[PDB]
């Protein structure tokens, strides 16, 4: 409801997406964020799904990039949808239990700063280390910013983070839907769409699969 | 007020301030069942408990049903899990139902007495110090206390949101169980099997290809 950048330049925007939230363009056609108590939760949820999806795309492409180039890894060339069957130093149950205890620490530490900001910036065991006060939920800073960023031009960095994150969430939905239909590596789908870009659209693979 | 039919005269006893501030009021009582206010007060409890038991039951049908058709469980059909699991059982069904009716009747009669008079179970000397957290909240049907461990009631904003989410998921699960029974009677298969049969041929495999929509 201003001169903000818009997803459809020209149309009306509902007004509660003015620009205070990072990287907004008024795209909410279902009108989900009418109550702002839902909108704050949705902002934190977009940050969390986006950061895990950015880690997901960086952990799916880069092992497949170095597999198709070719290094000598114990796991190299195995699919990301087949890495669960791959065996390790421990069976996957112990892996899942250690994961669901370490994230049970970390997520509740993050949620306590969601329900009261600035109230989790002190260590339990070393009560001399702290995050600097004045942080917002979703962006703790401190040791989570060790390279000295966010000390100027922070809105553009948040917009870069949310744009790369939305792109990587679409990329991971692409990884799901594009490994479920053709059943190949998502980099070996780019290989075929660069082999003959016209003779493999999604429509010809759909019609050949139909 | 977002009614179930947009052009209907809503019954006036669903437009009182006692009934408009009630969870999930879409103006639906075409047979006048709650015209007495205490009849409506009783049936609000009946709807909450018919919907919470249905959400638990329909979750216990289709969460292991979808985790059976996708592997990594071998839970049978819900209409077969009484035939099995009585062999893999320390007891027969009669003793188990007797223990069930004692443990559940002790709960349900306390709930009966709290509905007939609110804050009844909170009078001191009833339990061994446990009765102090048994007054419930200011409204009946939503006790809290020991029944809110995660503490979602200490908000007073978005509380009608949680009420209406409970009521709508519960009405959908009650329809889902009436489903499960009927789609068992009609074709003898399981519910996820019926979902797969609809999704492989929607325009020929439905409730117009059996003997229950008969002309």
């Amino acid at each position: 409801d201003a001169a903000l950048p818009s997803w459809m330049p020209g149309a009306d925007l509902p007004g509660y997406l003015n620009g205070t939230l990072p990287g907004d363009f008024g795209f909410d056609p279902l009108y989900l964020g009418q109550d702002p108590v839902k909108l704050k939760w949705y902002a934190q949820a977009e940050l969390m799904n986006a950061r895990f999806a950015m880690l997901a795309v960086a952990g799916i492409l880069v092992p497949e990039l170095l597999s198709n180039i070719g290094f000598s890894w114990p796991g190299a060339g195995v699919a990301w949808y087949d890495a669960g069957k791959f065996e390790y130093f421990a069976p996957a149950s112990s892996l899942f239990g250690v994961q669901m205890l370490l994230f049970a620490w970390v997520e509740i530490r993050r949620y306590q700063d969601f329900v009261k900001p600035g109230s989790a910036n002190q260590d339990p065991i070393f009560t001399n280390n702290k995050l600097p006060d004045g942080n917002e939920p979703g962006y703790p800073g401190g040791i989570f910013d060790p390279f000295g960023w966010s000390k100027g031009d922070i809105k553009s960095l948040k917009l870069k983070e949310i744009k790369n994150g939305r792109l990587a969430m679409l990329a991971f939905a692409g990884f799901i839907g594009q490994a479920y239909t053709t059943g190949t590596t998502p980099l070996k789908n780019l290989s075929t769409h660069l082999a003959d870009p016209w003779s493999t659209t999604v429509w010809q693979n759909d019609l050949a699969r139909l | 007020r977002q009614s179930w039919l947009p052009g209907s005269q809503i019954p006036a006893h669903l437009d009182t301030p006692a009934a408009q501030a009630l969870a999930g009021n879409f103006g639906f009582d075409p047979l006048g069942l709650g015209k007495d206010p205490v009849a409506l007060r009783w049936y609000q409890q009946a709807e909450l408990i018919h919907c919470r038991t249905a959400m638990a039951g329909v979750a216990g049908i289709l969460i292991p049903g979808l985790l059976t058709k996708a592997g990594a469980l071998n839970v049978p059909e819900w209409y077969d899990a009484g035939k099995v699991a009585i062999e893999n059982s320390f007891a027969p069904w009669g003793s188990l139902l007797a223990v069930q009716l004692f443990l559940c009747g002790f709960v349900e009669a306390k709930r009966w007495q709290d509905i007939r008079k609110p804050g009844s179970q909170g009078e001191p000397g009833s339990f061994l110090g446990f009765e102090a957290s048994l007054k419930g909240t200011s409204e009946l049907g939503y006790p809290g206390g020991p029944f809110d461990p995660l503490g979602l009631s200490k908000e007073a904003d978005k509380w009608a949101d949680w009420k209406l989410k409970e009521v709508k998921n519960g009405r959908l699960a009650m329809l889902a169980f009436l489903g499960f029974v009927a789609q068992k009677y009609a074709t003898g298969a399981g519910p996820v099997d019926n979902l797969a049969a609809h999704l492989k041929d929607p325009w020929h495999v439905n409730y117009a290809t059996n003997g229950v929509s008969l002309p």
Binding site: - | Q2, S3, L5, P6, G7, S8, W203, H204, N206, Y207, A208, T209, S213, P215
Partner: protein, 213 residues
């Protein structure tokens, strides 16, 4: 001073000339009450709408027959599209009853409350289901050409023309059934039978219309 269905007789009191296609035809006084008449205007309209759609359907699919195309007759088109196209029939009937029960109950609670069906209870449409008057809904969906607004006198002309074509399409759809229950063939085969010999291939020589043949 206005034309009546039966010249000489005055029009009845409940039937002054304000409706589209009014000619004073109510000998049985069925629409004597204003609200039952308000309901029968809606009924005459929607019977006329379906009869105009049906009459155009029979006439077009019977121009399709007899010229050489593969179209069936209208009494045979029910079987040939559920058998040529693998269509299960009771699901087609139930999908018809679902979609039209929606579209009909919207109209049925517009009649019971004229300002209703427009409060955005549907998918976010407010003025499009407002309803202009009885049997003439209008808006952006039911009048996309926008002929209900502009010149109002030409809109009253279109109202009367709609009612006229709807009356004789109801008569035509009552006549297609009688042409089929009497002769047993297509309607535009009955027309060419009446045109190849104007005498002797009329209704009085069909053996069924008059029993005193």
């Amino acid at each position: 001073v206005r034309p009546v269905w039966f010249p000489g007789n005055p029009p009845p009191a409940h039937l002054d000339g304000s409706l589209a296609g009014d000619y004073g035809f109510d000998p049985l006084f069925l629409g004597q009450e204003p609200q039952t008449l308000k309901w029968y205007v809606q009924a005459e309209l929607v019977h006329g709408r379906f009869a105009m759609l049906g009459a155009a359907g029979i006439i077009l699919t019977s121009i399709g027959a007899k010229v050489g195309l593969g179209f069936p007759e209208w009494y045979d088109a029910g079987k040939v599209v559920v058998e040529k196209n693998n269509i299960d029939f009771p699901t087609l009937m139930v999908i018809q009853f679902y979609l039209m029960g929606w579209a009909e109950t919207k109209r049925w609670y517009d009649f019971k409350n004229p300002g209703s069906q427009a409060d955005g209870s549907f998918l976010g449409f407010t003025e499009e289901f407002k309803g202009l008057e009885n049997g003439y809904p209008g808006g952006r969906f039911f009048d996309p050409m926008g002929l209900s607004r502009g010149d109002a006198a030409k809109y009253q002309e279109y109202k009367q023309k709609e009612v006229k074509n709807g009356r004789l399409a109801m008569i035509a759809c009552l006549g297609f059934a009688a042409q089929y229950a009497a002769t047993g063939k297509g309607p535009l085969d009955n027309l060419a039978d009446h045109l190849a010999d104007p005498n002797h291939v009329n209704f009085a020589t069909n053996g069924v219309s008059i029993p005193i043949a």
